[PDB]
Design a protein around this ligand. Structure first.
Ligand SMILES: Nc1ncnc2c1ncn2[C@@H]1O[C@H](CO)[C@@H](O)[C@H]1O
Ligand SMILES: Nc1ncnc2c1ncn2[C@@H]1O[C@H](CO)[C@@H](O)[C@H]1O
Ligand SMILES: O=C(O)c1cnc2ccccc2c1
Ligand SMILES: O=C(O)c1cnc2ccccc2c1
Ligand SMILES: [K+]
Ligand SMILES: [K+]
Lengths: 330, 330
């Protein structure tokens, strides 16, 4: 037996969520649908203009770990918060979901990362992230026994922004592979891909990453193309398994020459897209580590993603395991 | 012209909200549907057992002020937070709603008040409140110019728990009445009524309070009776105006021998009753300060209350003014 199905690694963030009109994004030069990095001064400025908000634990990989636990899988998470109230919230929420979380805060400054997420009327989310304590994550935060004992270790492309997180990831890759485990990454965001295009390709081609998650926008960015079919062929050539999401058009799972298309759930109304990709990865990786077919992994991913976009906030407040049972995915 | 329609005064609290099953309340000796005061040790214990949560600025009077501002009235708030992250969240949310809020924190300790609110499947809410920095609210926090320039000053019965807040309220009553303004209170909670029964009756009978808000449970507690008609007759004898809510049975507004019955609005589902009474007071006091009939104040209250119970969290995330316009209450 193994201790963990999925270890995830990412920027530990608390989300600050509000609604806005379309003009707000233009007025404040916020790139729509993207992760916009911001400094402390810009954080203060944007917050001063933001309406009344709700807070909820976030972080892309944090959400993915929570989702795996919610489905009934065994999950762990590495990510660095500060010894402050936001860090206490983050710690509580992830542990309360039944995710192993033991990364120790290093101090009160920089403070715990937060992301001001503006949700427009169409349900799109535009994130504005002050990394704070995330900049401190490094090799010292790798719990080697956890990596050794996890079927899959999954990490964010977003980790390439803070300075030393990549060193922790390279350590994880070494340990995972020495123990016959698999490594997975998400491309995270199309501008993130643009920042780290060559590095991401190298991760895949060198075999440090076995399973890659992308959406359409990320895949097009990765190969600098408007040809989605080219992007699919290239990504299949670059990694052992690729899971590519296409929003309302569902998803496609690629392995060598194999392609498995999955339909998206028909949605009544798109409330807030925050967490869609994260929860697709939850469903996929839960299925993968239970030995399910690639198609069924895709189905579980679409189920989880469809649920999270029908609520405000990034982590499903309902039972994913119950939903999967009703769906005959069990 | 006056600067403010409604000044509210209360315990400044950030809510930590989670769903639980019925047995959780019993196992943890949480009194269902009530405000349960807790110390620091008990807060740590309950939080350790609480599921993943979301945070939202709360405080009964805070919610009421926010609701008045939402409807288009001019609101102000007195309430004390700490110089910490939770206090910064509280400060942001109330000011971002357009409420005047200038109560200065006295340091970082005691920390900002928080309430762990457990919502059961029936939508009832059971609150567990650590008062923290609320214990420091005192006469020093009365902005006399704001009280002088507000049509109505409204305060929580909950203020009788912290040690010095009542002195600030007595100062408010003096200033308000010297400037020809009106004072209002909510009975807050049936156990709060039980703690301060004599003091609350005296506030009304001495004329320090002109307009009283109660629900059925609070009115029955106030007069220690199982007879609701007796409670209505007695409350009408004790205060100039009484607004008494009755959940799905709407409300009754009493003035001398005048009685005005108002129906609850049709709702999709009871998602979370948190803030129902607070927002009833918002709608009522908005109407009242706009010169509306007592019946129309009741209707505005039932509208605001009905909206808030159909969402998670204590402050409506949608426009109350727009809903009022659509409902023909305008
Ligand atoms: N730079 C970042 N790194 C990792 N996660 C992020 C970043 N910015 C925003 N997020 C998270 O992305 C999630 C949605 O995918 C949100 O819950 C938010 O916390
Ligand atoms: N002791 C208290 N005093 C004032 N407000 C409170 C108290 N406990 C809980 N609340 C608030 O009551 C609101 C619901 O009426 C919640 O938003 C919560 O913050
Ligand atoms: O080079 C491109 O074609 C390309 C495609 N998509 C992008 C998205 C974000 C940033 C750069 C991109 C660049
Ligand atoms: O004295 C009573 O009749 C009475 C009624 N309701 C209550 C609710 C809470 C606490 C005491 C109460 C006391
Ligand atoms: K969401
Ligand atoms: K509510």
């Amino acid at each position: 037996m193994t201790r963990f199905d999925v270890l995830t690694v990412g920027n530990a963030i608390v989300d600050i969520i509000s609604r806005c009109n379309d003009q707000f994004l233009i007025d404040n030069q916020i790139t729509k649908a993207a992760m916009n990095l911001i400094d402390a001064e810009r954080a203060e400025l944007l917050y001063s203009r933001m309406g009344p908000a709700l807070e909820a634990s976030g972080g892309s990989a944090g959400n993915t770990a929570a989702g795996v636990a919610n489905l009934g899988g065994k999950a762990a998470y590495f990510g660095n918060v500060a010894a402050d109230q936001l860090g206490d919230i983050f710690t509580h929420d992830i542990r309360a979901q039944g995710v192993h979380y033991q990364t120790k805060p290093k101090g009160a400054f920089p403070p715990t990362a937060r992301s001001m997420i503006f949700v427009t009327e169409d349900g799109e989310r535009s994130m504005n992230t002050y990394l704070g304590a995330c900049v401190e994550l490094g090799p010292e935060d790798v719990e080697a026994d956890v990596v050794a004992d996890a079927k899959v270790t999954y990490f964010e492309g977003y980790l390439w922004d803070p300075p030393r997180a990549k060193e922790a990831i390279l350590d994880c890759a070494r340990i995972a592979h020495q123990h016959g485990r698999e490594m997975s990454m998400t491309l995270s965001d199309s501008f993130c891909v643009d920042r780290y295009r060559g590095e991401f390709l190298d991760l895949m081609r060198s075999g440090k990453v076995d399973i890659v998650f992308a959406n359409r926008q990320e895949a097009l960015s990765l190969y600098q193309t408007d040809d989605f079919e080219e992007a699919l062929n290239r990504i299949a050539a670059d990694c052992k398994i690729a899971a590519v999401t296409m929003s309302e058009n569902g998803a496609v799972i690629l392995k060598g020459r194999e392609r498995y298309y999955v339909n998206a759930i028909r949605i009544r109304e798109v409330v807030d897209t925050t967490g869609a990709g994260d929860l697709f990865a939850s469903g996929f990786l839960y299925g993968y580590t239970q030995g399910r077919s690639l198609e069924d992994c895709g189905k579980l991913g679409c189920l989880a993603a469809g649920i999270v976009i029908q609520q405000i906030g990034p982590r499903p407040m309902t039972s994913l395991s119950e939903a999967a049972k009703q769906a005959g995915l069990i």
